[PDB]
Design a protein around this nucleic acid. Structure first.
Ligand SMILES: [K+]
Ligand SMILES: [K+]
Ligand SMILES: [K+]
Ligand SMILES: [K+]
Ligand SMILES: [K+]
Ligand SMILES: [K+]
Ligand SMILES: [K+]
Ligand SMILES: [Mg+2]
Ligand SMILES: [Mg+2]
Ligand SMILES: [Mg+2]
Ligand SMILES: [Mg+2]
Ligand SMILES: [Mg+2]
Ligand SMILES: [Mg+2]
Ligand SMILES: [Mg+2]
Ligand SMILES: [Mg+2]
Ligand SMILES: [Mg+2]
Ligand SMILES: [Mg+2]
Ligand SMILES: [Mg+2]
Ligand SMILES: [Mg+2]
Ligand SMILES: [Mg+2]
Ligand SMILES: [Mg+2]
Ligand SMILES: [Mg+2]
Ligand SMILES: [Mg+2]
Ligand SMILES: [Mg+2]
Ligand SMILES: [Mg+2]
Ligand SMILES: [Mg+2]
Ligand SMILES: [Mg+2]
Lengths: 261, 147, 200, 184
RNA sequence: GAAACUGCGAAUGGCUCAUUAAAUCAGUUAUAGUUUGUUUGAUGGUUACUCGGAUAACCGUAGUAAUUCUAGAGCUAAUACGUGCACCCCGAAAGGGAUGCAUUUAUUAGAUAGCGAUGAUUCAUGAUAACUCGACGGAUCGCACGGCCGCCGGCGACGCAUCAUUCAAAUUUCUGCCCUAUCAACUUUCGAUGGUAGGAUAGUGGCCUACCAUGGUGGUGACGGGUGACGGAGAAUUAGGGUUCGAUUCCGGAGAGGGAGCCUGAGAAACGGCUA
């Protein structure tokens, strides 16, 4: 190509969007923004495919152009705005507020939030370095830059960000023993306790996570996101709570449901 | 001396005409020879820390970083100036016959003056940015043959 | 050879056709921007001085200043320059076009002339009636300059001087006046205060 | 035009490379600046990839040169090119390129030296000038060329890239190395 | 609110498989080797109550067989164009110089085990001496009207610059490709392999120049030839192994009758752009 691609073929879209293959030749091309195109959920999908408020591509534009949708406390009018992990979506007219969290099967879930809990979000620190004039600053994995951070904050830590004051309220150091969630790969959406950190010079760092039921799984450091200090996460989790059940166990529940339901 | 080219060879950023003395200062400051550790558990040879050669492609005293793939092989050719050919021997699996065949690959690599190498010696090479048309590796360690 | 005579001072223009070769000898060998006396062009043109601005050959190709030849040449021209309008073409697009030289010759089909100095008798339809300008000044500074206004004197009270009044076919009355640009108003001062406030 | 692609090159084995695509704009080159010493300064602005700017100096006469030992930098006139390690033909053509040895006017540095050390090569003012004179040392080779009014200097900038000819005053063993090359 | 100027887009998409056999491409790497309109986040010093000259539409003299071929005259706008308020040194401690950001060079700090990061950087970044004839540092627009006695002030739009981010590219590591030896040597004057110093490039690199060295590949098949050869995801048939196919809707590459060159632009060696 001679430049930037502006189209996304439907079969080339991320699988976790769950788009029907015969629905059309194209899928919403995520706009540039805080989250990567492969790790986001465009507002058009959220409003039309997840919440059913809009029935067509056109109706999504009408909803957004009325300034009825807010992401991280700010109104967004871009249909393909890349809403991602931990983002807070608020719809004042419906009095609804959701947080984008992965379900245990690795797909974004619109977790309904209370009004009190919708005033903050968690961000993962990418790096900390000195800026112009020797002023230290840190940048996160959601595109945010914070100046004059706490000196104790380091890379891979998690910071609690207040969407009103736009300031770091509290932070969690990345260390063994904290509860973390997997944000990418095969184990995406699983929650467990960080048990070990295996460092390999010049290579990716591997982290071993043990589930609450004793199941142990590994992953890369880049796919980990600390949720709380100790064993209690600082955010509300969905019903599964990051517990991945085997297909046999899942089938067992389905069989029981039919008998009762 | 090491000054054998038409130009005067010196390490960049090392000022050799300072009124003050370099005693008690880190390498590369006060006129002291500059050297660094490449990491990954490799040791800096004594010949590079205490040497007088100038080589901007040296992994220890030059301006090249080691990052990427670390490979090992045997010195195949040592006739070029500060460059050697490293032969890497490996087995290629033939699926249909469920057997292997011996293959090889010649990897050009830069060798700094701090290293002594001869044909047949075992060498370890670390990847670096393109240094020439074919060279993308730098010698990090040399084990004499029969040792 | 035809002649397009224009009078910048009066705003009028007229086309003159001359077929006498002896009368055209004055213009021959002349270049663009050079002045030619109208005494030999005719009797009614006594005392008139004409400036050569350009022309077109018998094939319609225009004359280009700086081409010191009497023939036609092909040049790689930029859009918007004379002899290449380039309407509806890519920005930065260059086109090779044929242009006649700047030297006047009998090969020309028409010459554009500008009256730089009138003579004794005023020509009919060129110096008899003055065509008023269609539009008046629109920038605030130009309006003050036109009426010699001062810093304190208001400017919006003088635009009504050249206000245009007319009657529409479907209506009866209609007046239009220009919008003054670069006019200092309370809103403009408010913006400046806000911008300075943001810096603090 | 000029291209930096490897397609036209032979393989490391020596075999030819059959062409499989046309030249790309993102791998182009441009004509050398060939900057010369001349009082008619001329630097042309060049628009490069990304909308950025490069300054191509065709002729230069002055430069910003730094006296490393004294830690003083002054603007001075470039007088002559005396040595070039890449091609001696660039010396007689007076071409300004990085690492070229040139002679610069010594007048700007003499004024600072007199103003700083009070020496040619107000009660409180004399108090500090004599204090700084205690630790004053001047290389014999460096001082010898102050009489002629010219200092050997090395160009450290790239006139064809940044449009400027900056450098540093040669001293120490580097000065000895180059002056030996000029001793014929 | 037509028209017109200005801005943006037209580098995506669509089509095709000609060239191309470690090349494309695939998995897997690197950029501490670079550029990146936009999005998102942060960050931009202690005549001015607002400058200047043009031009389109329009208007009216036209030329040519003729084209979104073209000349001259009269008018008038800007977020068009061009301008412009906007610690250190010297020193009779007065005074003076420098003093935003960016650009270029040099000196210096960046410890130890006040003082940040990496497996690893004289790295991030600071201070200092100068340098540049610096498209930078808002002469812009909508809505709402209030609060103090002329002053002050709201919510937005658009735009300039820097860093990070996102969208991407470029180059790049390792391994892997069909038949042919009735192809055994190939490469190197005119770059072949490497070294030094430069030039050029967004940047690495014989990418190119000067000089120097004599290397580089090869029965583990180099080099050359054939292909009715774009590569892959895949397709057919398959007890197992396997055989054959893969122009074509997904991904990557390549081309726009054949070559070459180039403008504009963040992005093109563009072809529903230009030049030969
Ligand atoms: K491309
Ligand atoms: K465009
Ligand atoms: K690959
Ligand atoms: K292949
Ligand atoms: K380069
Ligand atoms: K070289
Ligand atoms: K553009
Ligand atoms: Mg395409
Ligand atoms: Mg790494
Ligand atoms: Mg206005
Ligand atoms: Mg337009
Ligand atoms: Mg072949
Ligand atoms: Mg390969
Ligand atoms: Mg630095
Ligand atoms: Mg080089
Ligand atoms: Mg040569
Ligand atoms: Mg095939
Ligand atoms: Mg073919
Ligand atoms: Mg195919
Ligand atoms: Mg075919
Ligand atoms: Mg077809
Ligand atoms: Mg395709
Ligand atoms: Mg093409
Ligand atoms: Mg055809
Ligand atoms: Mg083309
Ligand atoms: Mg077509
Ligand atoms: Mg096309």
């Amino acid at each position: 190509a001679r430049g930037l691609k502006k189209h996304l073929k439907r079969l080339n879209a991320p699988k976790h969007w769950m788009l029907d293959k015969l629905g059309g030749a194209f899928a919403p091309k995520p706009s540039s923004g805080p989250h990567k195109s492969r790790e986001c959920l465009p507002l058009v999908i959220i409003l039309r495919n997840r919440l059913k408020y809009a029935l067509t591509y056109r109706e999504v534009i009408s909803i957004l152009m009325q300034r009825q949708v807010m992401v991280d406390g700010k109104v967004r009018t871009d249909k393909t705005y890349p809403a991602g992990f931990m983002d807070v979506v608020t719809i004042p007219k419906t009095n609804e507020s959701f947080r984008l969290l992965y379900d245990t099967k690795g797909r974004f879930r619109l977790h309904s939030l209370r009004d009190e809990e919708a005033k903050f979000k968690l961000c993962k620190v990418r790096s900390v370095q000195f800026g112009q004039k020797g002023i230290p600053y840190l940048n996160t994995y959601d595109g945010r830059t914070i100046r004059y951070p706490d000196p104790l904050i380091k890379a891979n830590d998690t910071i609690k960000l207040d969407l009103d004051s736009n300031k770091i309220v509290d932070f969690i150091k990345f260390d063994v023993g904290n509860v973390v969630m997997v944000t990418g790969g095969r184990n995406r959406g699983r929650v467990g306790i960080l048990k070990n950190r295996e460092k390999h010079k010049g290579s990716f760092e591997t982290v071993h996570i043990q589930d609450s039921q004793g199941h142990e799984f590994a992953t890369r450091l880049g796919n980990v996101f600390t949720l709380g200090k100790g064993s209690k996460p600082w955010v509300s989790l969905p019903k599964g709570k990051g517990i991945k059940l085997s297909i046999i166990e899942e089938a067992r529940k389905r069989m029981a449901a039919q008998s009762a339901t | 001396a090491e000054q054998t080219e038409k130009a005067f060879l010196k390490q960049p950023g090392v000022f050799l005409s300072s009124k003050k003395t370099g005693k008690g200062k880190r390498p590369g400051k006060g006129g002291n020879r500059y050297f660094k550790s490449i990491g990954l558990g490799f040791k800096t040879p004594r010949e590079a820390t205490e040497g007088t050669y100038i080589d901007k492609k040296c992994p220890f005293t030059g301006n090249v970083s080691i990052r990427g793939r670390i490979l090992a092989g045997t010195c195949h050719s040592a006739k070029m100036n500060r460059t050697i050919i490293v032969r890497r021997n490996y087995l290629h699996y033939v699926k249909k016959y469920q057997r292997y065949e011996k293959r090889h690959s010649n990897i050009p690599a830069h060798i700094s003056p701090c290293f002594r190498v001869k044909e047949g010696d075992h060498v370890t090479i670390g990847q670096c940015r393109p240094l020439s048309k074919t060279v993308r590796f730098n010698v990090l360690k040399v084990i004499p043959a029969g040792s | 050879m035809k002649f397009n005579i224009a009078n910048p001072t009066t705003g009028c223009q007229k086309k003159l056709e001359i077929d006498d070769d002896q009368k055209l000898r004055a213009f021959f060998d002349k270049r663009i921007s050079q002045e030619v006396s109208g005494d030999s062009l005719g009797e009614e043109f006594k005392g008139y001085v004409f400036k050569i601005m350009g022309g077109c050959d018998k094939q319609g190709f225009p004359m280009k200043q700086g081409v010191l030849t009497p023939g036609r040449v092909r040049l790689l021209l930029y859009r918007g320059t004379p002899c290449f309008r380039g309407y509806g073409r890519r920005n930065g697009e260059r086109r090779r076009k044929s242009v006649r030289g700047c030297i006047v010759s009998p090969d020309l089909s028409v010459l554009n002339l500008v009256i730089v100095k009138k003579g004794e008798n005023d020509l009919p339809g060129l110096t008899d009636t003055e065509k008023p300008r269609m539009r008046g000044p629109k920038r605030a500074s130009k309006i003050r300059k036109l009426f010699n206004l001062s810093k304190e004197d208001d400017v919006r009270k003088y635009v009504n001087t050249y206000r245009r009044n007319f009657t529409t076919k479907t209506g009866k009355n209609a007046s239009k006046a220009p919008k003054i640009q670069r006019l200092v108003t309370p809103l403009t001062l408010q913006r400046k205060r806000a911008r300075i406030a943001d810096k603090k | 035009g000029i291209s930096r692609d490897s397609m036209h090159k032979r393989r490391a084995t020596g075999g030819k490379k059959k062409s499989w695509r046309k030249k790309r704009k993102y791998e182009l080159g441009r004509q050398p600046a060939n900057t010369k010493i001349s009082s008619n300064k001329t630097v042309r602005r060049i628009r490069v990839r990304g909308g950025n700017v490069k300054w191509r100096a065709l002729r230069l006469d002055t430069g910003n040169f730094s006296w490393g030992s004294e830690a003083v930098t002054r603007k001075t006139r470039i007088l002559d090119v005396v040595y070039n390690a890449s091609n001696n033909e660039l010396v007689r053509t007076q071409t300004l390129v990085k690492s070229a040895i040139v002679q610069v006017d010594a007048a700007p540095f003499k004024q600072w030296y007199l103003q700083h050390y009070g020496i040619d090569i107000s009660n409180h003012v004399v108090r500090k000038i004599e204090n700084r004179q205690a630790d004053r040392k001047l290389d014999s080779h460096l001082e010898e060329q102050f009489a002629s009014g010219r200092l050997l200097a090395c160009i450290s900038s790239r006139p064809g890239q940044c449009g400027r000819a900056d450098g540093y005053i040669l001293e120490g063993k580097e000065l000895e190395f180059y002056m030996k090359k000029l001793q014929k």
